[PDB]
Amino acid sequence: DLENVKAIAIVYRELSDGSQTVLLAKMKGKGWMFVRGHVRKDEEADPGVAAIRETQEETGFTGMVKQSGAPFTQPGSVITIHPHIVQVQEASKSKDTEDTVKREFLWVRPSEVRSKLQRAEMIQAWDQLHSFF
Secondary structure, three states, X not given: OOOOEEEXXXXXXXXXXXXXXXEEEEOOOOEOEOEEEEOOHHHOOOHHHXXXXXXXXXXXXXXXXXXXXXXXXXXXXXXXXXXXXXXXEEEOOOHHHHOOOOOEEEEEOHHHHHHHEOOHHHHHHHHHHHHHO
């Protein structure tokens, strides 16, 4: 892992009427979040690969990157974050995803997303990319 490079994936599904629904997550027990994880050294040339991998590991869904936003920087608890919009399309077949981490999930309409975000990092990712919806 690159310790100071992260990928965010704003995960959505395309609906039959041309609207979208966005997946939010929370570690039950600071609001809601998108998919987030470290970019591996072998993904540094295309952090969108990390976004798809993290989406599979967290949700059991796979799909494609629809938009890669500009990287942004955040202070450490500097982190460079690469935000993406990921359309999930099919179930993941990845062996790694046979055991996932327990997580709370919520599908919402795009109009519901911003009020569910409390952390600067997710607000920045949404601010850069929400016009896709």
